[PDB]
Design an enzyme around this catalytic site. Structure first.
Site, PDB file in Angstrom:
ATOM      1  N   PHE A 105      44.191  41.179  29.060  1.00  0.00           N
ATOM      2  CA  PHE A 105      44.114  42.594  29.698  1.00  0.00           C
ATOM      3  C   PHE A 105      43.406  42.595  31.128  1.00  0.00           C
ATOM      4  O   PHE A 105      43.583  43.967  31.713  1.00  0.00           O
ATOM      5  CB  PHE A 105      43.647  43.460  28.512  1.00  0.00           C
ATOM      6  CG  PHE A 105      42.020  43.321  28.214  1.00  0.00           C
ATOM      7  CD1 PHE A 105      41.026  43.715  29.020  1.00  0.00           C
ATOM      8  CD2 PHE A 105      41.727  42.416  27.446  1.00  0.00           C
ATOM      9  CE1 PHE A 105      39.719  43.418  28.780  1.00  0.00           C
ATOM     10  CE2 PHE A 105      40.274  42.244  27.157  1.00  0.00           C
ATOM     11  CZ  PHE A 105      39.233  42.561  27.749  1.00  0.00           C
ATOM     12  N   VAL A 144      40.610  45.932  38.216  1.00  0.00           N
ATOM     13  CA  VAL A 144      39.345  45.775  39.310  1.00  0.00           C
ATOM     14  C   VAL A 144      40.146  45.195  40.432  1.00  0.00           C
ATOM     15  O   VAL A 144      40.866  44.417  40.672  1.00  0.00           O
ATOM     16  CB  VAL A 144      38.395  45.118  38.880  1.00  0.00           C
ATOM     17  CG1 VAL A 144      37.198  44.916  39.911  1.00  0.00           C
ATOM     18  CG2 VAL A 144      37.755  45.361  37.502  1.00  0.00           C
ATOM     19  N   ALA A 145      39.952  46.109  41.836  1.00  0.00           N
ATOM     20  CA  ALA A 145      40.396  45.868  42.954  1.00  0.00           C
ATOM     21  C   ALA A 145      39.492  46.416  43.956  1.00  0.00           C
ATOM     22  O   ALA A 145      39.309  47.602  43.958  1.00  0.00           O
ATOM     23  CB  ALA A 145      41.912  46.006  43.149  1.00  0.00           C
ATOM     24  N   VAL A 146      39.365  45.590  44.906  1.00  0.00           N
ATOM     25  CA  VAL A 146      38.914  46.293  46.390  1.00  0.00           C
ATOM     26  C   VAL A 146      39.825  45.801  47.392  1.00  0.00           C
ATOM     27  O   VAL A 146      40.493  44.617  47.512  1.00  0.00           O
ATOM     28  CB  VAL A 146      37.446  45.446  46.881  1.00  0.00           C
ATOM     29  CG1 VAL A 146      37.116  45.717  48.256  1.00  0.00           C
ATOM     30  CG2 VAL A 146      36.534  46.124  45.704  1.00  0.00           C
ATOM     31  N   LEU A 175      32.664  46.564  44.997  1.00  0.00           N
ATOM     32  CA  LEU A 175      32.551  45.905  43.500  1.00  0.00           C
ATOM     33  C   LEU A 175      31.190  46.343  42.698  1.00  0.00           C
ATOM     34  O   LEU A 175      31.277  46.959  41.795  1.00  0.00           O
ATOM     35  CB  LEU A 175      32.728  44.503  43.581  1.00  0.00           C
ATOM     36  CG  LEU A 175      33.156  43.773  42.046  1.00  0.00           C
ATOM     37  CD1 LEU A 175      34.302  44.554  41.465  1.00  0.00           C
ATOM     38  CD2 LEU A 175      33.160  42.359  42.341  1.00  0.00           C
ATOM     39  N   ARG A 176      30.272  45.844  43.794  1.00  0.00           N
ATOM     40  CA  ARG A 176      28.767  46.195  42.767  1.00  0.00           C
ATOM     41  C   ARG A 176      28.728  47.699  42.353  1.00  0.00           C
ATOM     42  O   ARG A 176      28.140  47.951  41.515  1.00  0.00           O
ATOM     43  CB  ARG A 176      27.522  45.733  44.086  1.00  0.00           C
ATOM     44  CG  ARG A 176      26.201  45.888  43.274  1.00  0.00           C
ATOM     45  CD  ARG A 176      25.340  44.790  43.765  1.00  0.00           C
ATOM     46  NE  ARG A 176      25.341  43.612  43.459  1.00  0.00           N
ATOM     47  CZ  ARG A 176      24.766  42.762  42.574  1.00  0.00           C
ATOM     48  NH1 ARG A 176      24.223  43.571  41.610  1.00  0.00           N
ATOM     49  NH2 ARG A 176      24.938  41.478  42.137  1.00  0.00           N
ATOM     50  N   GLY A 211      30.215  46.022  49.518  1.00  0.00           N
ATOM     51  CA  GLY A 211      29.625  46.266  48.249  1.00  0.00           C
ATOM     52  C   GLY A 211      30.338  47.188  47.322  1.00  0.00           C
ATOM     53  O   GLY A 211      29.583  47.937  46.533  1.00  0.00           O
ATOM     54  N   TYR A 253      31.687  37.212  37.783  1.00  0.00           N
ATOM     55  CA  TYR A 253      31.376  38.002  36.830  1.00  0.00           C
ATOM     56  C   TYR A 253      30.080  37.628  36.370  1.00  0.00           C
ATOM     57  O   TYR A 253      29.360  38.511  35.699  1.00  0.00           O
ATOM     58  CB  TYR A 253      32.606  38.299  36.046  1.00  0.00           C
ATOM     59  CG  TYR A 253      33.577  39.037  36.432  1.00  0.00           C
ATOM     60  CD1 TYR A 253      33.014  40.504  36.794  1.00  0.00           C
ATOM     61  CD2 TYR A 253      34.833  38.813  36.995  1.00  0.00           C
ATOM     62  CE1 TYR A 253      33.968  41.356  37.257  1.00  0.00           C
ATOM     63  CE2 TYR A 253      35.588  39.892  37.555  1.00  0.00           C
ATOM     64  CZ  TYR A 253      35.334  41.113  37.736  1.00  0.00           C
ATOM     65  OH  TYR A 253      36.274  41.935  38.389  1.00  0.00           O
TER      66      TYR A 253
HETATM   67  N1  LIG Z   1      44.997  46.084  31.937  1.00  0.00           N
HETATM   68  C1  LIG Z   1      46.335  45.995  32.468  1.00  0.00           C
HETATM   69  N2  LIG Z   1      47.029  44.893  32.085  1.00  0.00           N
HETATM   70  C2  LIG Z   1      48.458  44.509  32.379  1.00  0.00           C
HETATM   71  S1  LIG Z   1      48.926  42.872  32.083  1.00  0.00           S
HETATM   72  C3  LIG Z   1      47.550  41.971  31.520  1.00  0.00           C
HETATM   73  C4  LIG Z   1      47.331  40.533  32.409  1.00  0.00           C
HETATM   74  C5  LIG Z   1      46.299  40.489  33.688  1.00  0.00           C
HETATM   75  N3  LIG Z   1      45.354  39.944  33.637  1.00  0.00           N
HETATM   76  C6  LIG Z   1      44.331  40.635  34.263  1.00  0.00           C
HETATM   77  C7  LIG Z   1      43.624  39.607  35.383  1.00  0.00           C
HETATM   78  C8  LIG Z   1      43.294  38.219  34.696  1.00  0.00           C
HETATM   79  C9  LIG Z   1      44.232  37.783  33.913  1.00  0.00           C
HETATM   80  C10 LIG Z   1      45.390  38.589  33.948  1.00  0.00           C
HETATM   81  N4  LIG Z   1      49.039  45.547  32.940  1.00  0.00           N
HETATM   82  C11 LIG Z   1      48.638  46.767  33.364  1.00  0.00           C
HETATM   83  S2  LIG Z   1      49.204  48.038  34.158  1.00  0.00           S
HETATM   84  C12 LIG Z   1      47.871  48.994  33.948  1.00  0.00           C
HETATM   85  C13 LIG Z   1      46.529  48.213  33.195  1.00  0.00           C
HETATM   86  C14 LIG Z   1      47.294  47.034  33.000  1.00  0.00           C
HETATM   87  C15 LIG Z   1      45.378  48.986  33.183  1.00  0.00           C
HETATM   88  C16 LIG Z   1      45.372  50.481  33.309  1.00  0.00           C
HETATM   89  C17 LIG Z   1      46.175  51.104  34.470  1.00  0.00           C
HETATM   90  C18 LIG Z   1      46.039  52.522  35.005  1.00  0.00           C
HETATM   91  C19 LIG Z   1      45.699  52.551  36.380  1.00  0.00           C
HETATM   92  C20 LIG Z   1      45.732  53.946  36.995  1.00  0.00           C
HETATM   93  C21 LIG Z   1      45.850  54.978  36.154  1.00  0.00           C
HETATM   94  C22 LIG Z   1      46.292  54.859  34.675  1.00  0.00           C
HETATM   95  C23 LIG Z   1      46.330  53.433  34.195  1.00  0.00           C
HETATM   96  C24 LIG Z   1      47.575  50.577  34.420  1.00  0.00           C
END
Ligand SMILES: Nc1nc(SCCCN2CCCCC2)nc2sc3c(c12)CC[C@H](c1ccccc1)C3
Ligand SMILES: Nc1nc(SCCCN2CCCCC2)nc2sc3c(c12)CC[C@H](c1ccccc1)C3
Ligand SMILES: Nc1nc(SCCCN2CCCCC2)nc2sc3c(c12)CC[C@H](c1ccccc1)C3
Ligand SMILES: Nc1nc(SCCCN2CCCCC2)nc2sc3c(c12)CC[C@H](c1ccccc1)C3
Ligand SMILES: [Mg+2]
Ligand SMILES: [Mg+2]
Ligand SMILES: [Mg+2]
Ligand SMILES: [Mg+2]
Ligand code: NA
Ligand code: NA
Ligand code: NA
Ligand code: NA
Ligand code: NA
Ligand code: NA
Ligand code: NA
Ligand code: NA
Ligand code: NA
Ligand code: NA
Ligand code: NA
Ligand code: NA
Ligand code: NA
Ligand code: NA
Ligand code: NA
Ligand code: NA
Lengths: 396, 396, 396, 396
Positions: free
Chosen positions: C396, C79-81, C91-92, C89, C120
């Site tokens: 994740f 999740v990023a803006v 994220l909403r 608005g 959240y």
């Molecule tokens: N969910 C993920 N986690 C991690 S490491 C977890 C630690 C972070 N964490 C999260 C925040 C709070 C606490 C620390 N690395 C990666 S890379 C990646 C993803 C992803 C999601 C899918 C994505 C994507 C994008 C565009 C097209 C296709 C796929 C590529």
């Protein structure tokens, strides 16, 4: 900018300069005690016009030197030049006047504690004792099997109020100072001062406790800010039994994490533990500085190692005379000569050799001490070395 | 839990235990260099079943001792017990096996560097050299008038790439190690290792530069994180001229605030400056540890002070034999006797006396060394003392 | 500012926003592994015009809940803006679109890890697991007599390369996750990722070692900068024997001063030591956050405490429905009703109760959960409580 | 080394040992207040010869336990062994004498605060309450919509001088202690002590202010050194309204950056904020320790959860008796039996279960508590659990 002996009218000006010049300065009620140690004509002030812009004095001390020999010693102290009157040659002028009075009064040596380590060399002062901070992490400290006083039955060490055992501390210190190079006679007025600092200052230092053994004592207080640290201000032991006993008691302070002490480099404490490394060296500095006022008087007065056999040489002190030096049976005869010099050194360097704290070989490697015979260097090293290791008595 | 000599099949297991046990461990390509210093049957592993849960080995070293005498020395190293196999007596078993092999091979002494200061005493190892960190605030550093090599004309010191002057460093070190107690022969493979660490590691250590004098060198690098600090990894000077020259060059690093070096307690650097205090002692630790494997072989091999006159005594080493010790003309004759002991000490204590780093009087005050004659203590002190001050060569 | 499902053309833009938005982001080669866990239509981007100014996606996860019941779980992530498009608005809008898709796909719950703890709640996410850093000063650590696996004979724990025992870790984790509330199925591609981080990064992280027991493992590495600290990245034990054994091995890391681990509040480690205090809690934070997507589906799916006897009530979730809730024999029946509510709470609060990490009484005292019957509060507390304590699987 | 009841002549010796043993010790004028809580024959000293080398005493306290039941409680305090008399078995001897007197006087429980967490387990003391430091960064703190007392009209909280509202604090605390497990009756003399510490000490602590609500109070002072930190020494709220109101007022200290409080793990504060994470847990430690002196008296006296249905078992306490334990309708009958034990535990472990702070399942996982029936573990967990969360009253 005239140089004078202060009158009682000058004291206010001296205490002002003192407060602005030294942060430790208590104030004019503690100055009464130390004043008794300054002889008539022991002080110079520099007036401007008038207020005091410069002051210096010496105290009558008794310094123990190798061979348990006690020298009258001019103790230099309370040296200050006003921030308004720097780089005006006032220290050079005041030091020269006091060194004349000290010399003419028949002191063989003068001594001081240095605020900075770069000032006093040029006036003939050499650092003569080394201070050594040991910090023990006492949570890990186990005594070695070989350590004394770890058997069954009672401990001979007592936890006491310092102020209720002044007599016993006095007696122990008096034995200590007579037997140890660096020792100073501590007069009554300075015991009066010491026990006043033993009680808690509001928003300042904590209560000092005492560990008392028949042949030793330790004064300690918990640090103001760090409540897991005990600072041992002073530990005097006359016997190895006393030294070990007192440290068994300090390591028994189970509410502390760390015991710290300013001691000497040959302190046996590390060897009392199974892990020598638990006594970390946290700090090292020059302690007492000596100026040899009369080379033949000083060299003749101290004892020398009996181990080194009889030998003779010519010592030159830079602008301090040339002398036929003959050492044997741990006595020295030191007499005028115009024979070729075999050893040259500045007067500060002799101060550094005098109590055995610095090896002649080490000062030679720095070329502070010139000789062309490496055999003579070995003989000086061995002769000037002190059987009893040199300690630092008390700051003045 | 059987105790064996490792085969080449065991190496993978040893490198795993090594990586988990020592953080400095590079990995199996630097292990090729040091492996050449381990003799056939110099290593023991403990297998469980199987993987390696314990290992220890010795390297064939050449240690210089007082009198410029070079002893074959078993250098103990790579000692590790798996975290899974603590308090299982594996170190006691491995140490006993290697000490047998070391003794039976005709090494008079073994040596090690200690990861903790509380482990090796009980196996007969005594700390024999002192490491001394000096940090110089070089912004304030002025050399004393008496200091060598501060005249007109050229400097004899050169700023160089270390790797383009291997031959010159080798020659200088070879002279250094032969002349200094604590010196080790440094073989080719360890020079290969040293110059590999002289170049910059990505996200690690910076480029090492060299200051080269005819009779001395200094390797230094700027600290990774603190960019106003220069770390002198190694300074070898054969002459006082070389030592002073090299320090004039290090104090010339005008972009640094601080120069730091691990040196010995008798390093003359403080005496080269007008302000001795500018060379602060920031750190002190045990360096090389000795186990005397054969008391008569070791005592006879080293030189003694010529200054102390001839004397005889009976030394007992705890579970190490009783010996008639006669010292004079700086040689010792050491022969079996059942005569009453005049000095007793554990074998670790003899290690500590052997290179002159610790005084017998100091160990006596801790009761690590028992005698009833204080005259004999003075004579041992004087005899065992080293003319050339003891230094630490390189960690292994 | 239209809201779309990204094509492969959008990936470059998403990786840019990712690198600028999350500092941990490796880069597009680690993104291949996680991408396999994002279903078709699991991602939304916001384009401007064009570049990506907003993105969000969910991953198909399997979350274990009390009663060893495994729920399909939309795992919200990435999740990023853009910093250029705040307070617009976005994220909403993105959250609303994904919550629709998640709901319509038949996920009973969604979950996330929170970058900040204030974002959240308003989207119906409640913190559901607590992270607990324990730092052990392992120099003082002695195991209690009552502790398992401190007898004679061999240890069943092995020091291993992680990468040579992937199969064994996989098997142990698979048992762990099925048996523990908070457990996630870890697919192959994430094991591939985990073992890649197990090896040393130049100028980054150190080698990871593994302690392997039949019924447990611990992955640990020494900290980059603090070389006396071991960081346990992951410890999975299926049995108390395994848990104690593994900690006996970690406390055996004699070259470390401190072992640190992120664990759960009910970790038995403090109770394995004679001094519970040696396991200091150094850090506490929310772990996994739950949004209950379907209240009746979620409440019915999990088990409840058998100890509390049968009881019935009406729960209202704010803009989430009113339900007749009947709990007994550790099953819940949850059915629509228009009867008067006895308990009201926002949907975030139910998330917080759902895995047993937070007591209903505690949320009641904060008025996050309204009821007029304190008996019903006790019954909810007791029913929702988890026999097996709730842990956090992997970020994740 | 005889063990005696101290006379008034012994007090000087006890105050000396106290000052050397505890850094918090005020001195003999604050000792008058607490002395009134020590009953005749509540103290033992150990004399050597003579001075006091050991002391221990208990105070008559009233401890609230689950079911709002108030037990007479021997409060152990002022325990000290002289640093000169360690490892001499003096604590074992003094503790044994007081435990006899406590037992024979008809106290069902004894309690203490631990200086170190590794001493009191072996004497049957189990940590029974958890202390929890919460630090709030109050610059970010916004109250949740659901939070009480955030409407229009006046605040019911007042900023007051503590010393002008002793009566109101007394009344509120008296209600608090009767209603909360861990509560102690606070007698007049300890209120006298508390309000003396409420005013500013020169070069010490700052003025304490009070926030007063009809049903709650908070005492706070700004930290000595950190002037952006408010330390809440004590917050007593009888109602959730009072608790929220008081925190609205503390978050209103707009000149502070951080509010810190030592509270309990179930403190609802995090749930009053929109960002739970703003209340960081900065510190966690054992609070009150219990020794169950009489197992049947203690188990019978406290209430149990009504939710868990009736069940029976046999509990064995190690060297503490075997008992038929039957629990139902939140009462326990506990009677002698020689039937086979179903649960074994050391006496310290029962202390830890007794106020509901530790789960039996958690102590089971550490094998501090043995049983072969996991159903019985669930039932103990549920029964011993406390509806009202356990708090810590005041240190003694
Ligand atoms: N969910 C993920 N986690 C991690 S490491 C977890 C630690 C972070 N964490 C999260 C925040 C709070 C606490 C620390 N690395 C990666 S890379 C990646 C993803 C992803 C999601 C899918 C994505 C994507 C994008 C565009 C097209 C296709 C796929 C590529
Ligand atoms: N020598 C003294 N020491 C101390 S405490 C020592 C620690 C300082 N030390 C010194 C520097 C380096 C290291 C720390 N306090 C005092 S007060 C006082 C004196 C003095 C000297 C005599 C003087 C005076 C003046 C005018 C008329 C009559 C007498 C009054
Ligand atoms: N002795 C060594 N030193 C170093 S760097 C010294 C610094 C550590 N020091 C030591 C501890 C205290 C203070 C710092 N690296 C290496 S690698 C290596 C050895 C070794 C020994 C031989 C070994 C081996 C094993 C199995 C088969 C064949 C050969 C491979
Ligand atoms: N129990 C006390 N507490 C406190 S402040 C509590 C904080 C310390 N706490 C305790 C340790 C761990 C955590 C912090 N002060 C005082 S003074 C005093 C007592 C006592 C006990 C009675 C005693 C006495 C002696 C001889 C004759 C007559 C009476 C005088
Ligand atoms: Mg000297
Ligand atoms: Mg030596
Ligand atoms: Mg939960
Ligand atoms: Mg409890
Ligand atoms: Na005192
Ligand atoms: Na003191
Ligand atoms: Na040692
Ligand atoms: Na001679
Ligand atoms: Na270079
Ligand atoms: Na270097
Ligand atoms: Na100097
Ligand atoms: Na002799
Ligand atoms: Na590895
Ligand atoms: Na790891
Ligand atoms: Na404990
Ligand atoms: Na019910
Ligand atoms: Na006030
Ligand atoms: Na307060
Ligand atoms: Na939150
Ligand atoms: Na039941």
């Amino acid at each position: 900018v005239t140089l004078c002996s202060p009158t009682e009218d000058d004291w206010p000006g001296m205490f002002l300069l003192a407060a602005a010049s030294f942060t430790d300065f208590i104030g004019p009620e503690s100055a009464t005690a130390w004043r008794t140690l300054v002889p008539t004509d022991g002080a110079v002030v520099v007036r401007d016009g008038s207020e005091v812009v410069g002051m210096a004095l010496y105290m009558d001390l008794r310094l123990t030197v190798p061979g348990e020999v006690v020298l009258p010693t001019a103790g230099l102290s309370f040296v200050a030049v006003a921030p308004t009157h720097r780089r005006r040659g006032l220290l050079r002028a005041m030091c020269a006047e006091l060194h004349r009075r000290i010399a003419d009064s028949g002191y063989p040596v003068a001594a001081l504690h240095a605020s900075e380590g770069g000032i006093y060399g040029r006036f003939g002062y050499g650092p003569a004792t080394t201070l050594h901070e040991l910090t023990v992490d006492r949570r890990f400290a186990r005594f070695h099997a070989d350590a004394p006083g770890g058997g069954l039955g009672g401990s001979s060490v007592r936890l006491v109020r310092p102020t209720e055992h002044r007599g016993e501390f006095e007696a122990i210190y008096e034995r200590w100072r007579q037997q140890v190079p660096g020792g100073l006679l501590r007069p009554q007025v300075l015991w009066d001062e010491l026990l006043a600092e033993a009680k808690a200052a509001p928003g300042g230092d904590r209560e000092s406790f005492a560990l008392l053994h028949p042949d030793g004592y330790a004064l300690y207080r918990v640090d103001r800010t760090d409540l897991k640290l005990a600072r041992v201000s002073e530990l005097r032991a006359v016997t190895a039994d006393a030294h070990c006993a007192l440290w068994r008691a300090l390591i028994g302070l189970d509410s502390m994490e760390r015991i710290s002490i300013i001691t000497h480099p040959q302190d046996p404490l590390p060897h009392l533990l199974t892990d020598t490394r638990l006594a970390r060296t946290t700090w090292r500095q020059d302690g007492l500085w000596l100026r040899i006022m009369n080379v033949p008087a000083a060299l003749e007065a101290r004892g020398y190692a009996h181990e080194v056999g009889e030998f003779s040489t010519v010592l030159e002190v830079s602008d301090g005379g040339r002398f036929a030096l003959k050492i044997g049976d741990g006595r020295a005869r030191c007499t005028p000569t115009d024979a070729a010099a075999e050893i040259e050194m500045d007067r500060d360097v002799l101060g550094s050799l005098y109590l055995g704290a610095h090896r002649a070989s080490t000062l030679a490697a720095a070329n502070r001490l010139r000789t062309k015979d490496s055999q003579l260097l070995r003989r000086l090293d061995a002769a000037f070395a002190s059987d009893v290791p040199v300690q630092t008595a008390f700051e003045f």
